């Protein structure tokens, strides 16, 4: 009573001969990465991603957002290469890297992240909380134009809202201040 | 003339008591045995005699996942490092999928 396997075996693509010539696992991190990469491949037997409920991940949704602008990637890449080459010529940066003491500004990197891959992180955080599942019922979009809203409570600080902040009702009793970049010739509709 | 002695052993009654499909509550022992045959997975704890018991109420499932040994166990460390580039283990794991929630919201008063 022996049944044939319903697919390729995980330890069948290699040969059992000439094992002394093959490169063995010299460390454990490589084996851990191999295991965590093989665990993501869809198998034909009973796996973990089947019984604990995955809400059917293999399912293409519908994008209802704005298309990305047409930007030449080769020009941006060569400009970034020239920039990092001009920055590498400095000796003070080398000394700061050798002395293990080199700090970077937070506002600049925050603005650059919001201008670049900001919308992608905002979309993934919105889909993590299940916003597109309850609002548009599966349909998702990407916020291209950035949005900035800050409440007004005391007299010096502020109460901002980002992608998952925490605002108390006592600090949101009045209408906040919404600020976003826009051109002269387009209307907007705010919904809360 | 009767040289052997001590071969009058008994059965340990070790085996699987709950198969896949039975409604197992919290605390029921899945299977007692020696040596790690069915490694625990989700909501399945262990003891001192290498036993298996459930932690939540639901349906017990038996799947086969990857086996990632602990770095402190040097025996498993060398057993893994002695493997060629592209060798996996894949042992049998026991999982308990929960069905009933751990609580809900209910109205009490109205002031």
């Amino acid at each position: 009573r022996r049944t044939p396997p319903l697919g390729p075996m995980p330890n069948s693509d290699i040969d059992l001969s000439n094992l002394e010539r093959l490169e063995k696992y010299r460390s454990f991190d490589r084996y851990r990465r191999r295991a965590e990469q093989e665990a993501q491949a869809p198998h034909w037997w009973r796996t973990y991603r089947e019984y604990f409920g995955e809400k059917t991940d293999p399912k293409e949704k519908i994008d209802i957002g704005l298309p990305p602008p047409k930007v030449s990637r080769t020009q941006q890449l060569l400009e970034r290469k020239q920039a990092i080459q001009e920055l590498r010529a400095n000796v003070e940066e080398e000394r700061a890297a050798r002395l293990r003491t080199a700090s970077v500004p937070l506002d600049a990197v925050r603005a650059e992240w919001e201008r670049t891959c900001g919308p992608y992180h905002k979309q993934r955080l919105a889909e993590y909380y299940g916003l597109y599942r309850d609002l548009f019922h599966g349909a998702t979009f990407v916020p291209r134009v950035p949005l900035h809203v800050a409440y007004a409570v005391g007299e010096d600080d502020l109460m901002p809202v980002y992608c998952g902040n925490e605002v108390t009702p006592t600090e949101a009793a009045q209408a906040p201040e919404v600020t976003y970049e826009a051109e002269e010739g387009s209307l907007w509709t705010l919904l809360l | 003339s009767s040289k052997n002695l001590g071969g009058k052993s008994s059965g340990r009654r070790q085996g699987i008591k709950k198969m896949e499909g039975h409604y197992v509550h919290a605390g029921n022992i899945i299977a007692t045995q020696r040596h790690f045959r069915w490694h625990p997975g989700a909501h399945v704890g262990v003891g001192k005699n290498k036993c298996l018991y459930a932690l939540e109420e639901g349906i017990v499932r038996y799947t086969k996942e990857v086996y990632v040994p602990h770095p402190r166990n040097t025996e498993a460390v060398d057993l893994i490092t002695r493997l060629p580039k592209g060798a996996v283990l894949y042992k049998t794991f026991v999982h308990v999928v929960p069905a009933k929630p751990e609580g809900t919201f209910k109205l009490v008063a109205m002031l």
Partner: peptide
Amino acid sequence: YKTKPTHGIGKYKHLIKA
């Protein structure tokens, strides 16, 4: 199990010679 198609999946000593 021996009769199930997933038989012999946990074998590991056949890939080593030490």
